[PDB]
Amino acid sequence: AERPTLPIPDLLTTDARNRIQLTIGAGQSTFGGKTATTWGYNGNLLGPAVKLQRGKAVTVDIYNQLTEETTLHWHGLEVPGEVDGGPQGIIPPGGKRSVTLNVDQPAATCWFHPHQHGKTGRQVAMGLAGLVVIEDDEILKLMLPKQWGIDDVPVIVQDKKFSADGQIDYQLDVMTAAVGWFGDTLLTNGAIYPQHAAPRGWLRLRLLNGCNARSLNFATSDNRPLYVIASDGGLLPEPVKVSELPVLMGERFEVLVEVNDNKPFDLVTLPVSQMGMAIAPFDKPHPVMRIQPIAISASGALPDTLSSLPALPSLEGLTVRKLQLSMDPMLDMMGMQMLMEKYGDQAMAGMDHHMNHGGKFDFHHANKINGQAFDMNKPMFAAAKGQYERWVISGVGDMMLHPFHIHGTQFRILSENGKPPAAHRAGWKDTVKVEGNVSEVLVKFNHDAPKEHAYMAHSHLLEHQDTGMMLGFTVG
Ligand SMILES: [Cu+2]
Ligand SMILES: [Cu+2]
Ligand SMILES: [Cu+2]
Ligand SMILES: [O]
Ligand SMILES: [O]
Secondary structure, eight states: OOOOBOOOOOEEOOOTTSEEEEEEEEEEEEETTEEEEEEEESSSSBOOEEEEETTOEEEEEEEEOSSSOBOOEEETOOOOGGGTOSTTOOBOTTOEEEEEEEOOSOSEEEEEEOOOTTTHHHHHHTTOOEEEEEEOHHHHHTOOOOOBTTTEEEEEEEEEOBOTTSSBOOOOSHHHHHHOOOOSEEEETTBSSOEEEEEEEEEEEEEEEOOSSOOEEEEETTOOOEEEEEETTEEEEEEEEESOEEEOTTOEEEEEEEEOTTOOEEEEEOOOSSTTTTSTTTTSOEEEEEEEEEEEEOOOOOOSOOOOOOOOOOOTTOEEEEEEEEOOHHHHHHHHHHHHHHHGGGGGTTSOOOOOOOGGGOGGGOOEETTBOOOTTOOSEEEOSSSOEEEEEEOTTOOOOEEEEETTOOBEEEEBTTBOOOGGGSSSBSEEEESSSEEEEEEOOOSOBOGGGOEEEEESSHHHHHTTOEEEEEEO
16 A cells, blocks of 8 residues: 555634634544544644744633543743643633733744643643644745645654554553653654655755654664754754754754655654663664655755854853752662563663552652652742753663753753753753753743742653653742
């Protein structure tokens, strides 16, 4: 059979009442010919791309048609805590919540997803994620590829695993609380190995790692380069040519890739050095999508200069906040041993060379920051508003991957896990790698967040977030 075409999320803008309507609900999808219950925004799976303009406000009406509580967070969008949609932003089953978003940041590809307390991994795994396309006046002058679904395409890459009856097989248990939820099936905008027909010239891909726990590393099957033009929080100062592009959970990058007649190629993901993630079929490069060239000229440009990136300021005198991540040694060892028992040595490929004892030992609060599993009732600190701060995040103490995300900001990385950031990671970021080492980021919060609607800071390995590796903080 030929490959299915890449599904393209609809690009949604406001009505005359300046509203966007999002409905959260359950439906059915098909994977490898078997039906599965899935959840989506304005559909059965995944979601639309909400288009936003800097300096314009929009109202979003969010209808929860699930039978359980959910929340909706705009990952990457800088908004007051009251509309950030962290775990306090509950939408009752059958209810509606409206938010007004006053967009105040540069053009970027952001995304949106649930943030239900303790259940974010399940609700993402069941299907909920959408996109946000922010535009501003500056980016349009660059004349980048801009025809949505033709030469400007979102690429949301996610793994799932399924039970024998075809349903999504999600469990938050000791093993996945330890290593994360991951699967053997790769989806690209919800489809298994689709093709995308692209005009000759430049193709812009807006890449999102939407996996719960799997890191990815994009490349092309014939080693043509990718030109990175943007990171989580928007354009880089100039394109950065790469041969491969590691993407942590929740991160976005936009790249341009050349499309030439008569020479289809795949976007692939290369095996990563992360526990559990190189089990077959991920022990080898894995196709993500086939790019099928069309002999029609694409009009987009790859300009020499994209944007202005301001200098890092002086660090002297800035508040230094320490965030020590930790896992429970016993439960980390127990989850890792279950992984090894299940899959054997392959569960550590590529890595560097039973009774109830009560609630004190409950894996649901095994992961922590500064000695505390997430307490929704107690923000850990009150950050300054409009002031740069230096946040120091340590994963010393274990070797698991902690992509650390801070709500309410786009920051600058000073140190990523003990090294200065790569050039394509040196611009605006909302995620920083922490793994066995220490990262430091320069953050500023432009909006208030009160105790009742606090900003989150957490690992975006969802099973770790849900089992305590998150803190709340206020601003203002
Ligand atoms: Cu976020
Ligand atoms: Cu997020
Ligand atoms: Cu978050
Ligand atoms: O997030
Ligand atoms: O998140």
